Structure 1
Amino acid sequence: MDGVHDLAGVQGFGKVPHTVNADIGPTFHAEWEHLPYSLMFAGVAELGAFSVDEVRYVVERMEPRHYMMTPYYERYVIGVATLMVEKGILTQDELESLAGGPFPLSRPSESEGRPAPVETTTFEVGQRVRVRDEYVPGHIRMPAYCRGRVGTISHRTTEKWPFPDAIGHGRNDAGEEPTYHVKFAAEELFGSDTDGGSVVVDLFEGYLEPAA
């Protein structure tokens, strides 16, 4: 999904609000902040109502202006609440009644997702690969800066996981794939307009194809 969450490479932001080893304060700065992650885990591990991938996607589905003005932990309060409503576990009415006011949610999905590709290649360390030049309206773990770009495999995972584009929509056809650490030259991604060396993206097999 080409949403505003796909921030890598966006220009115009100011300074990172940190200098190294500065005090970051306590883990939680407010008494509610542990709730989004804890209730995520209740949904995922206790209820089996959704996957972690569905949590990423529901956050991506926040209305774009809403996403941009909402602090991190609040996005996950909204996301988890949205999933609970979408899955039929809670109603928005009861959330708003308990909250004592408006509790707007993420926008409905505009894609049913897609299955794990049937045709993929097992790649090896040192091989050159291209990120498939594809556009996916639902959840995808490919940041746009690497779409259609060429890099070299530095690692093939020794474990496999469900394809996000499927499990992020709660589909039954996510299968399992390894991922690949794909190293791109900075100039491959941003031309002359970068001060970096290389960028390594951890990409599912289904996002990749042989280069050349």
Structure 2
Amino acid sequence: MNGVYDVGGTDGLGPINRPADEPVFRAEWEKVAFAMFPATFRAGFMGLDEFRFGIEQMNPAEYLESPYYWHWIRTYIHHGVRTGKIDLEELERRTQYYRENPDAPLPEHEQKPELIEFVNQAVYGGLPASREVDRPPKFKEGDVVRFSTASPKGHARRARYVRGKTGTVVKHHGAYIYPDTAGNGLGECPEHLYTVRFTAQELWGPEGDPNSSVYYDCWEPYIELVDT
């Protein structure tokens, strides 16, 4: 979508706030939001592309100024209700319970070794997105390509600052899960992936650096040929 999260090239967001140092997790709740990712993933709440789409449908002012891991909470709730796994009225009632009893205990539960096994496997083996396809790559290094002007409402990785722009293919990476189907519940439908180079003057007009370039990854349908 054309959401506010697609911030590349936006002005007026303010100076970078960068403490001289900071902890990994700034509060106990952040550890929780973090660990909830593997938990909802394994339970089938969503995958990576779908996860990102939930954050992209956030209220824009909240997205811009809330704590980062709060975005994760929002996307959890988004897909919990989407799949029917999270009953909102229950959730709201419990929030008011923990507002008023912030030290009340969590539900009694049994520890599950397979969830530790899951965590460890995912951290050290990863969740690789590369896939094999029957079709050969359409493009190749040196090809001059133009980025699609389509403006889908659903999930995609089509930053607005690159659309309709022309660049040169830098590398083909193989085929990978395709955000435009995956993020929208429509399967992996893998597509070839390429890095594409856009000069800053292509991107920003005369306001661009004459000695600078932006490298951006494009799935095959994003780009069409200009010159081979």
TM-score (norm 1): 0.82
Q: For 2:153, what is the secondary structure of its paired residue? A: coil
Deviations along 1:61-118, one digit per CA (max 9) or x if unpaired, are 01223323322111111111221111111111122122117xxxxxxxxxxxxxxxxx
Equivalent in the alignment of 1:182: 196
Deviations along 1:19-54, one digit per CA (max 9) or x if unpaired, are xxx64311001111122332122222x223311111
Identity %: 32
Cα contact 2:137–2:192 (8 A) shared by 1: no
Match status 1:124 vs 2:140: yes
CA distance in 1: counterparts of 2:45 and 2:55, whole angstroms = 16
Deviations along 1:102-152, one digit per CA (max 9) or x if unpaired, are xxxxxxxxxxxxxxxxx9962111111110121111111010100010001
Q: Compared with structure 1, are the counterparts of its residues 25 and 69 closer, same or farther at alpha carbon in structure 2 (3 Å cutoff)?
A: closer
Equivalent in the alignment of 2:37: 40
Equivalent in the alignment of 1:16: 16
Counterpart amino acid of residue 28 in structure 1: F
Q: For 1:178, what is the secondary structure of its paired residue? A: strand
Of 23, 28, 32, the match for 1:26 = 23
Gaps of 5+ in 2: 98-134
Equivalent in the alignment of 2:164: 148
Equivalent in the alignment of 1:105: none
Moved over 3 A (4+): none
Q: For 1:146, what is the secondary structure of its paired residue? A: coil
CA distance in 2: counterparts of 1:142 and 1:35, whole angstroms = 31
Equivalent in the alignment of 1:192: 206
Of 84, 90, 94, the match for 2:86 = 90
Equivalent in the alignment of 1:137: 153
Match status 1:56 vs 2:66: no
Match status 1:80 vs 2:76: yes
CA distance in 2: counterparts of 1:10 and 1:120, whole angstroms = 37
- The number of residue pairs the alignment matches comes to 189
Q: CA deviation at 1:188?
A: 0.3
Structure with greater Cα Rg:
2
Cα contact 1:120–1:205 (8 A) shared by 2: no
Gaps of 5+ in 1: 102-118
Equivalent in the alignment of 1:203: 218
Q: For 1:145, what is the secondary structure of its paired residue? A: coil
